[PDB]
Amino acid sequence: RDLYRNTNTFMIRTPIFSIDNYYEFFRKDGESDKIKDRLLEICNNSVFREAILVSSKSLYSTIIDFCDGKEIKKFDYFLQSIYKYLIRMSMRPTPFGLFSGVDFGKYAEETVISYENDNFKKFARPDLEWIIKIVKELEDNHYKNLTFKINDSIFIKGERALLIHSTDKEDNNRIGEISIRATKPFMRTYDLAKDGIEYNKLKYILIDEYSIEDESKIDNFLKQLIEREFLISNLRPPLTVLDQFDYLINEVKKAEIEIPLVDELTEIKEKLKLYNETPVGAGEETYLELYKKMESVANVKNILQVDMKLNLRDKKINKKIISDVNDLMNILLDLSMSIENPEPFLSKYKQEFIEKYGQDREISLLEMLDNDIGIGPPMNYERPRNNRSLDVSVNELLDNNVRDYFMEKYFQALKTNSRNIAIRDDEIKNLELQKIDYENIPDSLEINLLVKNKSEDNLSDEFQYYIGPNLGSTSAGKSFGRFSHMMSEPKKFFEELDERNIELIDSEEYVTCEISYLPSEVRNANVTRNIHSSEYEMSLFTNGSKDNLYRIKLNDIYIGLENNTFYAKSKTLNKKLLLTINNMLNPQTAPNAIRFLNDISLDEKKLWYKFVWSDVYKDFSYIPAIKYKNFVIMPETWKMNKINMKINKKTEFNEFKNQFNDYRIKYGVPQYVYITFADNRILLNLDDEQCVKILYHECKNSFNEIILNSYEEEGVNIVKESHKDYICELVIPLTKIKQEMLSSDISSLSKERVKDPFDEWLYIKLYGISSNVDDLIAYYISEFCNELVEEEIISKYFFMRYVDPEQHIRLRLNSSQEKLLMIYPKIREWLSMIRKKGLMTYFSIDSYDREIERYGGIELINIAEKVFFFDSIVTEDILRAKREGSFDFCDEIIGMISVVHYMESFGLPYAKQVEFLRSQVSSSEYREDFKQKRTEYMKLCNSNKDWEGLRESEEGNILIEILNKRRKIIEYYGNKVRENEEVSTDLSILDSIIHLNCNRMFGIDREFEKKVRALASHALYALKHFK
Amino acid sequence: MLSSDISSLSKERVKDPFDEWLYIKLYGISSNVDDLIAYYISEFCNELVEEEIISKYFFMRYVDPEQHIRLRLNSSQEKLLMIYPKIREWLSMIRKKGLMTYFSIDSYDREIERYGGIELINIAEKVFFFDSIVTEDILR
Amino acid sequence: ELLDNNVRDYFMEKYFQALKTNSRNIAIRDDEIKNLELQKIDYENIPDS
Amino acid sequence: LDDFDLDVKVKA
């Protein structure tokens, strides 16, 4: 069955030259060989000259000098650069500058793609660095005329206010945190400028409210706030508008500042429009005039950004291509189930979150990621690193059968001298892998494909697909975002994507939100300009396109765990957020907050281009192509190391050449390969190409990503201009087909939650008790603590067993601070006496962190702490009686009786008990044979009358009399729990108290508790006859 | 020095909480150290020393997974129990400003053999006191 | 156990070239081990017997 | 310190 459906359109990419210009230049279509001539015959090409001008001006000047016949200094670096750019313009589809272009097609019944006469329109727009330089200058000089607003990434921690990063730089290093003292005037400003305020309106209000008496004090205060970007002006353009330059012009006109600049900007706008009308190759003179004019306003390294559009005549493809992608995705998602732990760092972070905050709380995003007041970021995050000494070892737990399956394939391929590895559906089905759930399939994806017609002998749509080097993306619309200004109507595309995303999720609880942020290196933001159709927006360090009604803030997001998967929520909206980022920004370079928000949008979803074999074959220096029907998922790859290529940094050419031919003959490297960073396609039977390769190899440590890939050397291309072939790449966006108490307001350091030592609670941890726990609890703790309770020095106590690396006992005493400090001298004597007998080693006094939300809130936990007290008394009595020999029941029988007694007294009716115990899966089959003692269990676990089946003997009578001390308090607690209306699913509390009781009686043992629950469920199920 | 006869649980080696030593660990102080030490710990502890409630103190920085400050105060058990209520107020005031999160009271395990035996450890613990004072002054 | 990467590459290349030529053995040599540039062993780490 | 003093602290 098909999992994915196509959208309304796709993208086409094609370089500016045909592949004929590549073979003609490397003396393939002509046998003549010569360094110059061809170099002069290309450097005088108009299209080549302009394409170089738009990208590298220095090389353009050097080309002009060379054409003038002047003395070129190097002439080696010159030749290498010219060769690399010519190869890129002929053979690399990826769009950049005037080297390559983009267009948008449609699906149909037949494939026809053709070129029009008027190709290659230009789309020139000012760079972001230029605009930001102008904006900063304006707001530095004319701040008095501007309107300012508060930054959305601000975080107030105690008496300091912080930002996640800074757009500026410290000397020559980035700024990872700026903190200022959050004084009273700062808070007043933080309230006034919440949604925008004029400079004078704020300044005079502050002067009125403080009287300062020195105006230069307020001016410096506000200027210091503005310089550090705590206040954002209205001149700064959004990244999610369709035109940043027009927005800036309108804003400066509104402010009425720097009149000379306003007319100059309009002149630049007018000139910039003319350049967009010239054909490619004819705009050299206009570009220079425009560049000279623009550089006079603000001189920066990057001034103009240029893109071009193919403008094809026909752009249809056969809709059969969507079936093949579905087959590929079926097999790729089937294999994904062989890896058990695909995200180890996030899986560890979930455990840290659960250990710290439990599962019934929602924690602020910025507090959670803080090193001091949180748990820090995951252990692989590079922006502020976790300063804790945790273990970073990780293991993805690949299945052994699949690992063996992929090694036989490699061995067979080597033995038979085959160049490819073919995987098949029937072979994968024999591995008996687990099935994937509809909840783990990603909602949308994109895939990059190079399509080549299999053969011209039949004139038929037999297509051969090669997955592109980048493999696509994890969401539909990420690749299309950058080109929003070139689409005919971009809104309809993103509106459809948003509608489909909403269709796939439960409504009335979710909203869509777009994350936009302006990095420190504003050069990286040129790819972040894009449109979106999400309902809300969060813009950091820039203005937003939305009204203040649809504005989100970083200090408003709250994180939680539901079904063991993270989610984000907005406190003000009370809606969960469905976060989107419609651009190819690399998360790993972003701050921790942005990177974390990106991660949890893919939480528990399989990543389709994380291949299983990548870990099996990582140690090999040769890997054959991996194929599936008519897909080449991976190309054939060779890589060089110090063993097979002994190259020194001082190695001379003509010795590398002779050493490299041995490599070619030994490993069978074909004639055409890709050098897979930036130099790409290379013809190895050409001296200049090997010169390129030695220059690249020597610099790149001789191992640093020197990976050769085979060329797509079968089939023919599908895009033709008259009779010239063009290399074409498709980007196919797909969407999934649809198949049918946390509101607590207690802060983390509230006096209700954390109790300091002797703050009404004395919390003691006893170490070194492993071998004598039962005797200690039964005889020593019991007597001393009960004597304290009777004397009225403490009101109650309870204990439990835990493990922080080492095993210990946690004992908590409740009384006033004065009494707790009064009896401590006697507690020391007691513990010294206990130690002298070898029953313990040492102890500590710790802070008590109460689990308010886990036990029903602030009003009900005070009763859970009495339930714990009576349960501790009962545990002591049972252990003492068991050691004295009063009864001889096994551990399992005691556990079962205790669980049944808890459920019966809490008020859970029999109709629910078997469902309740089965809810943890334990009751399925696991201990059906172990219940071979059916009769004894059925007699003991029946609670009819007054446990009549248990009171038949003195042992059972004693056991049931010990337990009844615990009944009235549990009944009271259950009544109060079910009386509350804010508390839902009281079955969560019952499970917690049962877990605690089992821990007290038997310690840390998961398997034993599972067994006890399973046996209890089976025993209760068999008694269905007696109700 | 390996011939030491002091047992592992000897009263000379392991000191229980308030057993002539009050040993406190402060958590959540990563970002504001050199201000906590320079201004807050210094003024409170030196004031205690001048009033003769404690005879000496010293501190160090460590990491048990999480980073913290270890602060050790020396006095008799009676004075340590009498002055503790004021220490809680001090630490609450420090927390309210966001300088720390929470603390614990632990057992002091002395390194007798590392600093020359049972007669010289008592002088190493004064070397530590004066070095802590000098560190505070330099940071300030 | 932190095995060196050069030695891992050395043995993987040996195995590959053994499979390709259909040979039944892998031969290690003193001069080949010399070029790996390994650390020298101390007299205090050599087993006594 | 006065209310208008912002003790700027920067990490780099």
Numbering used by the authors:
A (entry chain B): 2 to 741, 751 to 1037
B (entry chain A): 751 to 890
C (entry chain A): 397 to 445
D (entry chain D): 2 to 13
Give the exact sentences the study uses for this entry.
To elucidate conformational changes upon substrate binding, we also determined the structure of MadB in complex with the MadA variant MadL3 at an overall resolution of 3.1 Å. MadL3 compromises the LP of MadA including the first ten N-terminal amino acids of the CP. Electron density for the stretch of residues −20LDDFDLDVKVKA−9 was clearly resolved and could be built. The LP of MadA binds to the RRE element in MadB, which is present in the majority of prokaryotic RiPP classes. Substrate binding induced the formation of a four-stranded, anti-parallel β-sheet, which is a three-stranded, anti-parallel β-sheet in the apo-state. We investigated the interactions of MadB to its substrate via LigPlot+27 with standard settings, which mostly found backbone to backbone or residue to backbone hydrogen interactions (MadB-MadA: Thr184 – Asp−18; Gln225 – Leu−15; Arg182 – Asp−19 and Asp−16 ; Arg161 – Asp−14; Ser180 – Lys−12 ; Gly177 – Lys−10), but also some side chain to side chain interactions were observed (MadB-MadA: Lys218 – Asp−19; Glu178 – Lys−10; Asp785 – Lys−12). Beside hydrogen bond interactions also hydrophobic interactions could be observed for the amino acids F−17, L−15, V−13, V−11 of the MadA LP with the RRE of MadB (I176, I179, I181, P186, F187, I213, I219, F222). Interestingly, most interactions originate from amino acids of the GD, but also interactions from the ED of the opposing monomer towards the substrate were observed (e.g., Asp785). Residues 164–179 rotated by 8°, which is a prerequisite for substrate binding and formation of the RRE as the β-strand of the LP would severely clash with the loop in its position in the apo structure and thereby prevent binding of the LP as it acts as a lid closing the pathway for the substrate to bind. In the case of the ligand-bound state, hydrophobic interactions are formed with Ser154, Ile155, Arg229, Tyr518, Phe542, Leu519, Pro592, and Ile595 as well as Val−5, Lys−6, Val−7 and Ala−9 of the LP.
Maddinglicin A (MadA) produced by Clostridum maddingley belongs to a group of antimicrobial peptides, the so-called lantibiotics or in brief LanA1. The first necessary step is the dehydration of serine and threonine residues, which is catalyzed by the MadB enzyme in the case of MadA. The structure of MadB in the apo-state was determined at an overall resolution of 2.7 Å. MadB is composed of an N-terminal glutamylation (residues 1–741) and a C-terminal elimination (residues 742–1038) domain. MadB forms a homodimer as already demonstrated by SEC-MALS with a bifurcate cleft-like structure in the center.
